[PDB]
Amino acid sequence: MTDSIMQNYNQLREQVINGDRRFQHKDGHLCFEGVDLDALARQYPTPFYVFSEPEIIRNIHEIQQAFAAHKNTKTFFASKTCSVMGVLKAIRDAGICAEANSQYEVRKCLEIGFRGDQIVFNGVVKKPADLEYAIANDLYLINVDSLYELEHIDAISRKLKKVANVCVRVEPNVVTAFHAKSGLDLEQAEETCRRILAMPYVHLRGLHMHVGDQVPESEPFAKATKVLVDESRRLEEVLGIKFDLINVGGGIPVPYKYDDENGDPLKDNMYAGITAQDFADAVIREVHKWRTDVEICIEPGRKVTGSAAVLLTEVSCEKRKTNYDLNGNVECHVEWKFVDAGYSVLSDSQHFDWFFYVYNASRMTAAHDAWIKLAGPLCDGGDYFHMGVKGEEFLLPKETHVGDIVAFLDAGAYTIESQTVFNNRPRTGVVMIDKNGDTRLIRREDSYEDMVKYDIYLA
Amino acid sequence: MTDSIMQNYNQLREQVINGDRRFQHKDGHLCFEGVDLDALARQYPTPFYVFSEPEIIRNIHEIQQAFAAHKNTKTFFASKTCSVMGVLKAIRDAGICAEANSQYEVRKCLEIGFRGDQIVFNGVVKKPADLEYAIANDLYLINVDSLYELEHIDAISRKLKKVANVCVRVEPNVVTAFHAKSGLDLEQAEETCRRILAMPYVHLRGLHMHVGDQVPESEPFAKATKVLVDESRRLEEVLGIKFDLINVGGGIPVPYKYDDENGDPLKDNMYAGITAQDFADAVIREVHKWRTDVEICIEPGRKVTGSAAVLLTEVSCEKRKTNYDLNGNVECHVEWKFVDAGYSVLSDSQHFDWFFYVYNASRMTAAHDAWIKLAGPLCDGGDYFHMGVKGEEFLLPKETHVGDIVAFLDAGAYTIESQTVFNNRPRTGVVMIDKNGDTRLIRREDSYEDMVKYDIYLAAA
Ligand SMILES: *[C@@H](N[C@H](CCCN)C(=O)O)c1c(COP(=O)(O)O)cnc(C)c1O
Numbered sequence: 011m012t013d014s015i016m017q018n019y020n021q022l023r024e025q026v027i028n029g030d031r032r033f034q035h036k037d038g039h040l041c042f043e044g045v046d047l048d049a050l051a052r053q054y055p056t057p058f059y060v061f062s063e064p065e066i067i068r069n070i071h072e073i074q075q076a077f078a079a080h081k082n083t084k085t086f087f088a089s090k091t092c093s094v095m096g097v098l099k100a101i102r103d104a105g106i107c108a109e110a111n112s113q114y115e116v117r118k119c120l121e122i123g124f125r126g127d128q129i130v131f132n133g134v135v136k137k138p139a140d141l142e143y144a145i146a147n148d149l150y151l152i153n154v155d156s157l158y159e160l161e162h163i164d165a166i167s168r169k170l171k172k173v174a175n176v177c178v179r180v181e182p183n184v185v186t187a188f189h190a191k192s193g194l195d196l197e198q199a200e201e202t203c204r205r206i207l208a209m210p211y212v213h214l215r216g217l218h219m220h221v222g223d224q225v226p227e228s229e230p231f232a233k234a235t236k237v238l239v240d241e242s243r244r245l246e247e248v249l250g251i252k253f254d255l256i257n258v259g260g261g262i263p264v265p266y267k268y269d270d271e272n273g274d275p276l277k278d279n280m281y282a283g284i285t286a287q288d289f290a291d292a293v294i295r296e297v298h299k300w301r302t303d304v305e306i307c308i309e310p311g312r313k314v315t316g317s318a319a320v321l322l323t324e325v326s327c328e329k330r331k332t333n334y335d336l337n338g339n340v341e342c343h344v345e346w347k348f349v350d351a352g353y354s355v356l357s358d359s360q361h362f363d364w365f366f367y368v369y370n371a372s373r374m375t376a377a378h379d380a381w382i383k384l385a386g387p388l389c390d391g392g393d394y395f396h397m398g399v400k401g402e403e404f405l406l407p408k409e410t411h412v413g414d415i416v417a418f419l420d421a422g423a424y425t426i427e428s429q430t431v432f433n434n435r436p437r438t439g440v441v442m443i444d445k446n447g448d449t450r451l452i453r454r455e456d457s458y459e460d461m462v463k464y465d466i467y468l469a
Numbered sequence: 470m471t472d473s474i475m476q477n478y479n480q481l482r483e484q485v486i487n488g489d490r491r492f493q494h495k496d497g498h499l500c501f502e503g504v505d506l507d508a509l510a511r512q513y514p515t516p517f518y519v520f521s522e523p524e525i526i527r528n529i530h531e532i533q534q535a536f537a538a539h540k541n542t543k544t545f546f547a548s549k550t551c552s553v554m555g556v557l558k559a560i561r562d563a564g565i566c567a568e569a570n571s572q573y574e575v576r577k578c579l580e581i582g583f584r585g586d587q588i589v590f591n592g593v594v595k596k597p598a599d600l601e602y603a604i605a606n607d608l609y610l611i612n613v614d615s616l617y618e619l620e621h622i623d624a625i626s627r628k629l630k631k632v633a634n635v636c637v638r639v640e641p642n643v644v645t646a647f648h649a650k651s652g653l654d655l656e657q658a659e660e661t662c663r664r665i666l667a668m669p670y671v672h673l674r675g676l677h678m679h680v681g682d683q684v685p686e687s688e689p690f691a692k693a694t695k696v697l698v699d700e701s702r703r704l705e706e707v708l709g710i711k712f713d714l715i716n717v718g719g720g721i722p723v724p725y726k727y728d729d730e731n732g733d734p735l736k737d738n739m740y741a742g743i744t745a746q747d748f749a750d751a752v753i754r755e756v757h758k759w760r761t762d763v764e765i766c767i768e769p770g771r772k773v774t775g776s777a778a779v780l781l782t783e784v785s786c787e788k789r790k791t792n793y794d795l796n797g798n799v800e801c802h803v804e805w806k807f808v809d810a811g812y813s814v815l816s817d818s819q820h821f822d823w824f825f826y827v828y829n830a831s832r833m834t835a836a837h838d839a840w841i842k843l844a845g846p847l848c849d850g851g852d853y854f855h856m857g858v859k860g861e862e863f864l865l866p867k868e869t870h871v872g873d874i875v876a877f878l879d880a881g882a883y884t885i886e887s888q889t890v891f892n893n894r895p896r897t898g899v900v901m902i903d904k905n906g907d908t909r910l911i912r913r914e915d916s917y918e919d920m921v922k923y924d925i926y927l928a929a930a
C-alpha cells in the first residue's frame with residue numbers, strides 16, 4: 011500500500027544516484043555532472059536553477075541519432091522552451107538550429123550567433139513590424155499561419171525587395187477548428203500555395219505542422235505526417251514543383267516519471283510513452299513513401315532541455331498541524347515543510363499539474379521515509395505543491411531540517427520565462443555546468459532595483 | 470437560449486456606457502473617467518493596462534464607510550494585489566495603510582511613503598534577513614505564522630535591541646491540517662502567546678486570520694471571526710492581558726459578472742455575493758461580542774484595485790476555420806479573432822478560470838452580435854481565452870476588424886506582477902488616470918534590452 015509506494019520511491023531514489031547518466035552522490039549529497047548540489051546551493055542564493063550543458067548535448071545526440079535513416083534532417087530547437095542566452099549558446103555550440111516565437115526571440119537567436127538561415131519564425135500573430143524584421147534578416151523559414159498574415163508577407167517582401175522564405179502551416183483533422191487556433195485548414199493549402207508561387211518575393215519551401223507537446227504515442231505523429239506527405243505529393247504534381255522540405259514540428263516527450271512498468275502514458279502523460287527513435291521511425295516511414303531526398307525539419311523543444319536542469323530550493327520553515335477529535339485527542343498530524351520556491355518560480359507545478367521528482371539533495375543517500383506536504387513561500391493558500399508521490403504528499407528523510415536543499419529534477423523546459431514577481435519575490439538566478447564540469451552564473455536573480463526600475467515614480 | 474444569452478450580454482453592454490460610475494462612450498468608443506480608450510490605445514502600444522485613481526478612491530471609500538460602526542478600524546491594502554509604485558502612491562494618498570508579503574514589498578512600501586507604523590508584514594517564509602529588515606524598520610505588525618519563525622523573531626529582536634510588534638496567525642478550523650499551510654492551529658495559540666509575553670523584545674498585539682479570496686458569502690467571515698474573538702477573549706482572561714487589536718485579513722469580493730439576477734454566487738464566484746458593508750457587518754458584530762474599543766485591522770486587496778483597471782489589447786489577426794465531414798461537407802465554421810495579449814499578460818484568465826467582461830472598445834455602441842473565439846499570440850495551443858460568454862465563445866460585433874481595440878474590464882487585481890516573458894513577449898506598460906482625468910505612463914513595457922540584461926553572456930561577434 012503506502013509502504014509499497016515508499017519502497018518504490020526509494021528504489022527510484024537509489025537509481026538516481028546509482029545508474030543515471032546525470033547524477034551521482036558524494037558526502038551524502040546529490041551531484042549533477044560531478045557538481046555537489048548542496049555545496050552549489052551554499053555558493054548561490056536559493057532558489058535557483060542549474061542547467062547541465064553535458065545533458066543538453068546528450069539530448070541533442072538522441073534526437074539526431076534517431077534520424078540517422080534520413081540524412082537530410084534539420085533540427086530547430088524551439089526556443090520558447092528556454093531562451094536564457096547561455097542555454098541558447100550551449101545549443102548553438104552543440105551544432106543545431108533555432109525556432110523562434112516572437113520578434114525578440116528572433117533577435118536573441120541572431121545575437122547569440124544563429125545565422126538567419128538557421129532560424130524558423132512561427133506564430134499566430136506576426137505583426138508587420140515582426141514580419142519586416144524577419145524578412146530583413148533572411149530567415150530560413152517564416153511559417154504562414156493565416157491568409158491575413160500572408161497578405162502582409164506579400165506586401166512587405168515587395169517593399170523590401172527581399173525574398174521571404176515560407177512554409178504553409180496546415181493543421182490536419184486527426185474538434186480541430188474549435189480547439190486549434192493555429193494553421194490553415196488542409197482544404198486551403200492548394201490555393202494558398204498557388205498564390206505564393208505567383209508572389210514575386212515569396213518563396214514556398216514546403217508545408218508545416220505541429221502536433222502538440224509531451225505526446226505519449228506515435229500514432230498522432232504518423233497520421234499527421236501522412237496527411238502532410240499526401241498533400242505535399244499532390245501539390246508537387248498539381249503545381250509542377252519540387253518542395254525543399256517538410257516541417258513536422260515538435261512534441262517528443264520527456265520522462266517525468268521513470269517507473270514505466272507502473273505507468274499508463276495515455277492516462278498520465280508524465281510517463282513519456284515513446285522515445286525520439288519512435289517519433290523518427292513514424293515520421294521517416296511516412297516521408298519515405300514520397301521522397302528520400304527531401305529535407306525533414308523538426309522543432310523539438312522540451313526534449314532538448316527538459317531533463318537538463320534541477321531547481322534547488324532551501325527548506326526555509328517547517329510546522330506541524332494536527333487534526334483533533336472531539337475529546338482533544340490526536341486524529342492525525344501533517345508535517346509541512348516550506349521551501350523558498352513556490353509557483354512563481356516553478357509555474358507548471360501549479361498551473362499544468364506537472365510532476366517533477368522531489369528529493370532532499372542534502373540527504374540524498376538517506377531513506378526518504380517520512381510523508382510531508384511541501385509548501386512554497388507565497389502569501390497564497392494555493393501555493394503548495396499538489397503533485398506528490400502519493401496524492402498531495404511527498405517523501406523526505408525524517409532527518410530533514412531547515413537549511414537542507416531540496417531538488418526538483420527534470421526542471422529544464424518551460425521553467426524560466428514562465429516565472430513571475432508575484433509578492434515581489436524575485437525571478438531566480440540560473441547556473442550552468444559547462445562541458446568541463448565548471449559552473450558559472452548565466453542569469454542573475456532579479457534585484458530590488460529590478461523590482462521598481464520599470465515603474466515611473468518620484469519617491 | 471443562445472439568443473437570450475446574446476440579448477442579456479447586450480443589456481450588460483448598454484449598462485457599461487449608461488449607468489456605470491467608471492465608463493462612458495464618445496464617438497462610439499469606450500471611455501474610462503472620460504478618457505477615450507480607443508484613442509489611448511493609439512498613443513501607447515498595446516497590450517497595456519490603464520488604472521483609474523478616481524475608482525481606487527471610490528473603492529477605498531466603500532471599505533471605509535462600511536466600517537463606520539467601529540471607529541477604531543485600520544485598513545491595510547494587501548500590496549500583493551498590485552504594487553506598481555504609482556498605484557501604491559495613490560493608495561497612500563487616499564489615506565490607508567499597507568500590507569506586505571515579502572522583504573521587497575516592505576521596502577517598496579517604505580520607499581513610496583508608508584511609515585513603518587503603517588505596514589503589516591505577513592508570510593509563511595520570513596527568513597532571518599527578512600525579519601531583521603522588518604524589525605529594524607519598526608513595522609506596525611509582523612505576523613507570527615509558525616513556532617520556528619518565532620524563535621528567529623526572539624533572537625533577532627534581541628540582537629537589534631528593538632521591539633518586534635506581532636500578531637499570532639491562527640487558522641480557524643471551520644481539512645485545515647491537510648489543506649491550509651498558513652497559521653498555527655487554534656490549540657497552539659495559548660502557549661505561543663505565553664512564550665511571546667516572556668520574550669523581552671517581542672510585543673504581542675493580538676491574533677490574525679485570513680479567510681480567503683473572492684469569498685461570496687458572509688457566513689465564513691462571521692464563523693472565522695467568532696473563533697478568533699472567542700480565543701482572544703479567553704486569552705485575555707487566562708494571561709491577564711488586554712490585546713491592542715484583532716486582524717481579520719482580507720477577502721472582500723469584487724463583481725466580475727454583474728447580472729446577479731441570473732447568477733448564483735455559491736455556484737459561480739464571479740458573482741460577488743456580498744458587499745463591503747456585508748463583510749463589515751459580519752466582522753464588527755462578532756468583535757463587539759467581546760470589545761467595542763479594540764482596534765480591528767483589515768487587509769483588503771482585490772476590492773481596492775480590482776474594478777479600477779482595464780486591459781487594452783489590439784485585434785491583430787483573424788481567420789475562419791472550418792470543420793468538414795469525411796465527404797467534404799461543412800459541419801461548422803469558427804471565427805477566430807487574435808489579440809496581442811495572451812495568458813502571459815492576463816494570467817488568471819487561464820490559470821484560475823477567471824472571467825472578465827470582454828467588449829470591442831472601438832465599437833462599444835455596436836451590437837455584440839457574432840459568436841467568436843478569442844485567441845492570444847503565444848505559440849501554444851492552449852493560449853486562447855476559455856472563459857467565454859457561452860462556453861468558450863465570446864460576442865463581438867460582426868464588423869469587428871483587425872485594428873480594433875478589445876477591452877477586458879475589472880482587470881486591476883493580481884494582473885501586473887503575475888505577468889511573464891513567455892515567448893519573449895514583453896510584460897506590459899501601465900497607464901494611470903489621475904484625479905484630474907489626465908493620463909501618464911507609470912510602468913514601461915519591458916524592452917528587448919531589459920529582457921536580455923539579466924543574462925550573463927559574451928556578445929557574439
Ligand atoms: C511549442 N508547442 C506548445 C508547447 C506548450 C508548452 N506549455 C504546444 O502547445 O504544443 C512548439 C514546438 C515545441 O514543442 P515541444 O513539445 O516543446 O517539443 C515546436 N513547434 C511549434 C510551432 C511550437 O508551437
Ligand SMILES: *[C@@H](N[C@H](CCCN)C(=O)O)c1c(COP(=O)(O)O)cnc(C)c1O
Nearest residue numbers: 390391547679681682719720768769770771
Ligand atoms: C491574499 N490571499 C490570497 C490571494 C491570492 C489570489 N490569487 C489568498 O489565496 O487568499 C491576502 C490578503 C488579500 O486578499 P484579497 O482577497 O485580495 O482581499 C490579505 N491578507 C492576507 C494574509 C493574504 O494572504
Ligand SMILES: [Cl-]
Nearest residue numbers: 084085106107
Ligand atoms: Cl541541424
Ligand SMILES: [Cl-]
Nearest residue numbers: 667668669670
Ligand atoms: Cl528578559
Ligand code: NA
Nearest residue numbers: 055056057324
Ligand atoms: Na539559501
Ligand code: NA
Nearest residue numbers: 206207209212
Ligand atoms: Na513566389
Ligand code: NA
Nearest residue numbers: 665666668671
Ligand atoms: Na514579550
